[PDB]
Design an enzyme around this catalytic site. Structure first.
Site, PDB file in Angstrom:
ATOM      1  N   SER A 152       0.788  -1.220   0.000  1.00 60.84           N
ATOM      2  CA  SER A 152       0.000   0.000   0.000  1.00 60.84           C
ATOM      3  C   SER A 152       0.816   1.262   0.000  1.00 60.84           C
ATOM      4  CB  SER A 152      -0.883   0.057   1.228  1.00 60.84           C
ATOM      5  OG  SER A 152      -1.859  -0.966   1.166  1.00 60.84           O
TER       6      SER A 152
HETATM    7  C1  LIG Z   1      -1.686  -2.199   1.772  1.00 60.93           C
HETATM    8  O1  LIG Z   1      -0.603  -2.642   2.167  1.00 60.93           O
HETATM    9  C2  LIG Z   1      -2.925  -3.039   1.933  1.00 60.93           C
HETATM   10  N1  LIG Z   1      -2.394  -4.338   2.330  1.00 60.93           N
HETATM   11  C3  LIG Z   1      -3.013  -5.525   1.867  1.00 60.93           C
HETATM   12  O2  LIG Z   1      -3.984  -5.448   1.135  1.00 60.93           O
HETATM   13  C4  LIG Z   1      -2.458  -6.846   2.246  1.00 60.93           C
HETATM   14  N2  LIG Z   1      -2.556  -7.619   0.997  1.00 60.93           N
HETATM   15  C5  LIG Z   1      -1.499  -8.543   0.689  1.00 60.93           C
HETATM   16  O3  LIG Z   1      -0.604  -8.670   1.493  1.00 60.93           O
HETATM   17  N3  LIG Z   1      -1.537  -9.270  -0.606  1.00 60.93           N
HETATM   18  C6  LIG Z   1      -0.477 -10.214  -0.836  1.00 60.93           C
HETATM   19  C7  LIG Z   1      -0.206 -10.265  -2.398  1.00 60.93           C
HETATM   20  N4  LIG Z   1      -1.533 -10.414  -3.131  1.00 60.93           N
HETATM   21  C8  LIG Z   1      -1.512 -11.222  -4.331  1.00 60.93           C
HETATM   22  C9  LIG Z   1      -0.914 -10.427  -5.434  1.00 60.93           C
HETATM   23  C10 LIG Z   1      -2.676  -9.729  -2.656  1.00 60.93           C
HETATM   24  O4  LIG Z   1      -3.747  -9.850  -3.229  1.00 60.93           O
HETATM   25  C11 LIG Z   1      -2.567  -8.994  -1.449  1.00 60.93           C
HETATM   26  O5  LIG Z   1      -3.430  -8.188  -1.137  1.00 60.93           O
HETATM   27  C12 LIG Z   1      -3.066  -7.490   3.462  1.00 60.93           C
HETATM   28  C13 LIG Z   1      -3.932  -8.561   3.396  1.00 60.93           C
HETATM   29  C14 LIG Z   1      -4.496  -9.156   4.658  1.00 60.93           C
HETATM   30  C15 LIG Z   1      -4.160  -8.640   5.884  1.00 60.93           C
HETATM   31  C16 LIG Z   1      -3.218  -7.475   5.949  1.00 60.93           C
HETATM   32  C17 LIG Z   1      -2.699  -6.935   4.792  1.00 60.93           C
HETATM   33  C18 LIG Z   1      -3.907  -2.315   2.835  1.00 60.93           C
HETATM   34  N5  LIG Z   1      -3.248  -1.368   3.735  1.00 60.93           N
HETATM   35  C19 LIG Z   1      -2.929  -2.006   4.962  1.00 60.93           C
HETATM   36  C20 LIG Z   1      -2.311  -1.067   5.928  1.00 60.93           C
HETATM   37  O6  LIG Z   1      -1.731  -1.543   6.945  1.00 60.93           O
HETATM   38  O7  LIG Z   1      -2.344   0.193   5.756  1.00 60.93           O
HETATM   39  C21 LIG Z   1      -4.257  -2.638   5.446  1.00 60.93           C
HETATM   40  C22 LIG Z   1      -4.022  -3.746   6.478  1.00 60.93           C
HETATM   41  C23 LIG Z   1      -5.174  -1.572   6.015  1.00 60.93           C
HETATM   42  S1  LIG Z   1      -4.912  -3.318   3.921  1.00 60.93           S
END
Ligand SMILES: *C(=O)[C@@H](NC(=O)[C@H](NC(=O)N1CCN(CC)C(=O)C1=O)c1ccccc1)[C@@H]1N[C@@H](C(=O)O)C(C)(C)S1
Length: 513
Positions: free
Chosen positions: A245
């Site tokens: 992100s």
């Molecule tokens: C930003 O970092 C975003 N994080 C996620 O969406 C995160 N997703 C992933 O790690 N993945 C792994 C790779 N793939 C395949 C290509 C994905 O589809 C994917 O999304 C995620 C998923 C589950 C639990 C935590 C994180 C958002 N921003 C964070 C943040 O900390 O700001 C959130 C947790 C709010 S979601």
């Protein structure tokens, strides 16, 4: 047959300092005691006294000389203080000769071990800056002539053939005060969180200077007795990860630069998923039905960012990322440093286009990530990185329009300060801006991702009104107090940025707190 021997005169290795002169690597004088066994065999009565002055056992000391009675030269003990050695030489024991050497000493130890590195027993740079500037820091030894007799006793130092020349001083860009602060906070966070590793990079956004760079685990370069390979890695520079992100603000920059989007536009994100092919984009926070652009970052909607990405196309995103330097060569030439990877496909399917836009399928170093955030914070002007002190502010390259940069700055300030934002990233006294991130780690032993291993990120800059420093905080595999970027890394950002700004006398722009 008595002869003239040539002996070496050790050269002074160059001083490594921080940006203000704090010494980080120094050649300290020490004394090495050597002996002529033949000459010592004629004073056996003095041995026990000598062995006790060197802390050795009398019999073991004696076996040594006896084992080497034939030699005209052996080391007694190497590396003493200049006081001790001259204390022992004052005993006037026959056959005992001193010689001044140097020991490389690192005053801040593990605090700066990764950036500075170290030399080997023959004072060749092996890791880090020691390695990278070895030619610059090395000096040329001298040689001199000694006259020895039949039995190896030194009669005269006859001449110096060539003088020793010392290495050159190197001033790094690091501010050791910030480095001390950064190291301690990162270590605290690592321990509180039960994490395996972490990095923390701080950059002057105007000059490109790396102000601090710490990783965990670390090591003491002054004592590498039980050193493990893991602890030696300057992860900030040589370890790559998917930024997740934390790349959205650049996706968002591409969008505003496309002419096809504006801050007030609203995107429908219901129901927090978006199926395409057999792959499903998901949001974590599934609350709001529709978000404006600022709310896409605040709530970090992958779905939201994907939809914008489908509108504007991959090439406009790939290109902003490239311009801010993600997957690009930094130009530092730090040993082991990675470039990372910005994938380039012929045609860009929806899937790869979306994942690219929210930070997967590309890999960066913490150093690149900070470099990119610095460009954003410097009103879209990217300035080349330096790990050495910068004389005059360099010419930068305008990689994002000032107006887009300015807009995205305001958005990221919101991400921190707006209700439902990343409030743990707030810096007392100042306005700050930034982006949370949380990435599943890549499976060991297969493709795809781990069900319970996370990397926590926070990347931002301050002060929001007039940015001076960018920072990145990356923590691997926290397991004790949650794993979200904004719970784990943001509080580290909060404290270090606070100290950082204070320690550089930047006046608070948020008197209210
Ligand atoms: C930003 O970092 C975003 N994080 C996620 O969406 C995160 N997703 C992933 O790690 N993945 C792994 C790779 N793939 C395949 C290509 C994905 O589809 C994917 O999304 C995620 C998923 C589950 C639990 C935590 C994180 C958002 N921003 C964070 C943040 O900390 O700001 C959130 C947790 C709010 S979601």
């Amino acid at each position: 047959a008595r002869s003239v021997r040539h002996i070496a005169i050790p050269a002074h290795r160059g001083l490594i300092t921080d940006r203000n002169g704090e010494p980080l690597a120094v050649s300290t004088p020490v004394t090495t005691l050597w002996a002529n066994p033949k000459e010592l065999m004629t004073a056996k009565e003095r041995w026990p006294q000598l062995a006790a002055a060197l802390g050795q056992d009398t019999k073991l000391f004696a076996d040594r000389i006896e084992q080497n009675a034939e030699r005209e030269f052996i080391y007694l003990v190497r590396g003493l203080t200049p006081e001790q050695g001259e204390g022992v030489i004052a005993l006037k024991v026959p056959g005992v000769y001193s010689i001044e050497e140097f020991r490389r000493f690192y005053p801040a130890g593990e605090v700066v071990a990764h950036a500075v590195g170290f030399t080997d027993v023959d004072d060749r740079g092996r890791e880090g800056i020691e390695l990278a500037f070895d030619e610059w820091l090395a000096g040329v030894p001298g040689k001199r002539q000694v006259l020895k007799d039949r039995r190896g006793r030194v009669i005269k130092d006859v001449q110096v053939t060539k003088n020793a020349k010392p290495g050159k001083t190197l001033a790094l860009s690091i501010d050791l005060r910030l480095q001390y602060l950064a190291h301690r906070e990162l270590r605290n966070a690592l321990l509180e969180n039960g994490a395996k590793a972490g990095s923390l990079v701080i950059m002057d956004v105007k000059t490109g200077e790396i102000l601090a760079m710490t990783n965990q685990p670390t090591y003491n370069p002054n004592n590498r007795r039980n050193l493990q390979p893991a602890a030696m890695r300057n992860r900030a520079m040589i370890d790559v990860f998917e930024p997740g992100s934390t790349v959205k603000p650049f996706s968002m920059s591409a969008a505003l630069a496309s002419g096809r989007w504006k801050p007030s536009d609203i995107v429908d994100v219901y129901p927090g998923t978006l199926q395409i092919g057999r792959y499903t984009i998901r949001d974590v926070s599934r609350n709001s039905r529709q978000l404006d652009l600022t709310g896409i970052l605040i709530k970090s909607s992958n779905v939201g960012i994907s939809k914008i990405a489908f509108d504007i196309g991959a090439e406009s995103i790939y290109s902003v990322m490239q311009q801010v330097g993600l997957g690009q060569d930094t130009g530092l030439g730090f040993p082991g440093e990675r470039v990372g990877n910005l994938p380039n496909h012929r045609k860009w399917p929806k899937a790869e286009t979306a994942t690219l836009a929210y930070g997967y399928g590309l890999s960066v170093t913490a150093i690149q990530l900070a470099h990119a955030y610095a460009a954003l914070a410097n009103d879209g002007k990217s300035v080349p990185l330096s790990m050495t002190r910068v004389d005059r502010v360099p010419d930068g390259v305008q990689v994002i329009s000032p107006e887009v940069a300015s807009t995205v700055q305001g958005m990221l300030q919101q991400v921190v300060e707006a209700q439902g934002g990343v409030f743990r990233a707030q810096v007392p006294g100042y306005h700050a801006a930034g982006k949370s991130g949380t990435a599943r780690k890549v499976s060991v032993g297969t493709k795809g991702y781990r069900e319970n291993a996370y990397r926590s990120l926070f990347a931002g800059f301050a002060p929001a009104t007039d940015p001076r420093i960018a920072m990145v905080v990356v923590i691997d595999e926290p397991s004790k107090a949650g794993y979200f970027g904004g719970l784990v890394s943001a509080p580290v950002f909060s404290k270090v940025m606070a100290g950082a700004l204070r320690l550089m006398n930047v006046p608070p722009d948020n008197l209210p707190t």
